[PDB]
From Swiss-Prot, chain A:
Keywords carried by this UniProt record: Acetylation, Intellectual disability, Isopeptide bond, Proteasome, Ubl conjugation
Part of the full-length chain shown: 153 to 456 of 456
GO term, biological process aspect, one: proteasome-mediated ubiquitin-dependent protein catabolic process
Name of the protein in question: 26S proteasome non-ATPase regulatory subunit 12
Quaternary data: Component of the 19S proteasome regulatory particle complex. The 26S proteasome consists of a 20S core particle (CP) and two 19S regulatory subunits (RP). The regulatory particle is made of a lid composed of 9 subunits including PSMD12, a base containing 6 ATPases and few additional components. Interacts with ERCC6.
N6-acetyllysine, modified sites: 69, 216
Keyword Acetylation: yes
Role description: Component of the 26S proteasome, a multiprotein complex involved in the ATP-dependent degradation of ubiquitinated proteins. This complex plays a key role in the maintenance of protein homeostasis by removing misfolded or damaged proteins, which could impair cellular functions, and by removing proteins whose functions are no longer required. Therefore, the proteasome participates in numerous cellular processes, including cell cycle progression, apoptosis, or DNA damage repair.
Disease: Stankiewicz-Isidor syndrome: A neurodevelopmental disorder characterized by delayed psychomotor development, intellectual disability, behavioral disorders, mild dysmorphism, ophthalmologic anomalies, feeding difficulties, deafness, and variable congenital malformations of the cardiac and/or urogenital systems.
Source species: Homo sapiens
Occurrences of domain PCI (ranges): 90-268
From Swiss-Prot, chain B:
Superkingdom to which the source organism belongs: Eukaryota
Cysteine-cysteine disulfides: none
Subunit details: Component of the 19S proteasome regulatory particle complex. The 26S proteasome consists of a 20S core particle (CP) and two 19S regulatory subunits (RP). The regulatory particle is made of a lid composed of 9 subunits including PSMD11, a base containing 6 ATPases and few additional components.
Subcellular location: Nucleus; Cytoplasm, Cytosol
Protein name in UniProt: 26S proteasome non-ATPase regulatory subunit 11
Similarity annotation: Belongs to the proteasome subunit S9 family.
Length: 304, 55
């Protein structure tokens, strides 16, 4: 039916597959017959069908008792469809499992695939929780420093300094130019719409990210002037605010006259904020004054 | 909607409901901001808006 040209039987085989995959336990046969799910799926391109069948796909698996050989390839061919149907975060549990791939096969071709896609899920990782722990998993690797993008990952790690992306332009350009490592950048950009969407959402993600970083700082960086230093319009900044409302910007202080924003200085309840601050400050001061004082009192005894 | 029954009150209740949703949506993150700028997106008069709000 593949070469026949009839896609009307896809619903049939994918319907019967659900019946054939239940009522018995098959380790070898199920894995070999599970490719039929994502086989005609490329022709069908149905969202709800994909919603039913990674759900019925990845439901139970751990490590062993599955051999076709070639497993890592199919694994790379699995959630890529969920990436095509999905957007970004869908690959978080996808590209994090590829660390065992260079162990099974030659590490020569892993530079253009594994080490290329290993930064993807850690870049697209949520800024809430996973960003904290997941960055320590990729760390410690000796091949990590070999990657020219190590400095970029270092800039995306913590304490990001404000810089122009125009310098990164030729970096990404030559990243497309050289075929030594992370070669399939053209394959990533193979789709005209997908590449632009991913790029724009990447720039949006980092331009949100640095704001989230400076959000903790009370230094009042005056984003009105920052927009002038970055040479950008305030309209797309208001769009970034439209992203901020679902990014939970709900706690802040703004002004009608000027454009100065305040992420701090609340109503300041006397029994909460200044109370807690005075608590920690005075207590720490007292105990610290208590320690090194008598510590020195013990130190001067060594002179006698 | 001229021959519409008494349920028109419920229709206006749903309209005011969605209106309340929008009002607690866009205004909430703004402590103090221009009214014309925030009404520029909804492109409607600030009269009925101010009336419902004050109400």
């Amino acid at each position: 039916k593949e070469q026949n040209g009839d896609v009307k039987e896809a619903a049939s085989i994918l319907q019967e597959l659900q019946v054939e995959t239940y009522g018995s336990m098959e380790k070898k046969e199920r894995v070999e017959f599970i490719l039929e799910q994502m086989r005609l799926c490329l022709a069908v391109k149905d969202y709800i069908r994909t919603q039913i069948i990674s759900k019925k796909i990845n439901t139970k698996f751990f490590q062993e008792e599955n051999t076709e050989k070639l497993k890592l390839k199919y694994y790379n061919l699995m959630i890529q469809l969920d990436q095509h149907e999905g957007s970004y975060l869908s690959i978080c549990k996808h590209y994090r499992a590829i660390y065992d791939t260079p162990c099974i096969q030659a590490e020569s071709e892993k530079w253009q695939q594994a080490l290329k896609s290993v930064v993807l899920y850690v870049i697209l990782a949520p800024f809430d929780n996973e960003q904290s722990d997941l960055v320590h998993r990729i760390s410690g690797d000796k091949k990590l420093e070999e990657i020219p993008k190590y400095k970029d990952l270092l800039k995306l790690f913590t304490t990001m300094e404000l810089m122009r992306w125009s310098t990164l332009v030729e970096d990404y350009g030559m990243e497309l130019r050289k075929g030594s490592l992370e070669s399939p950048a053209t394959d990533v950009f193979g789709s005209t719409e997908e590449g632009e969407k991913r790029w724009k959402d990447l720039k949006n993600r980092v331009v949100e990210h640095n704001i989230r970083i400076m959000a903790k700082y009370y230094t009042r960086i005056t984003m009105k002037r920052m927009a002038q230093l970055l040479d950008l319009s305030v309209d797309e900044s208001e769009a970034f605010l439209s992203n901020l409302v679902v990014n939970k910007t709900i706690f802040a202080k703004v002004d009608r006259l000027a454009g100065i924003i305040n992420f701090q200085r609340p109503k300041d309840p006397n029994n909460l904020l200044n109370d807690w601050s005075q608590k920690l400050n005075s207590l720490m001061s007292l105990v610290n004054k208590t320690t090194h004082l008598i510590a020195k009192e013990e130190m001067i005894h060594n002179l006698q | 909607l001229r021959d519409d029954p008494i349920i028109s009150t419920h229709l206006a209740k749903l309209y005011d409901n969605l209106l309340e949703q929008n009002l607690i949506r866009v205004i909430e993150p703004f402590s103090r901001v221009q009214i014309e700028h925030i009404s520029s997106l909804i492109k409607l008069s600030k009269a009925d808006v101010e009336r419902k709000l004050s109400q």
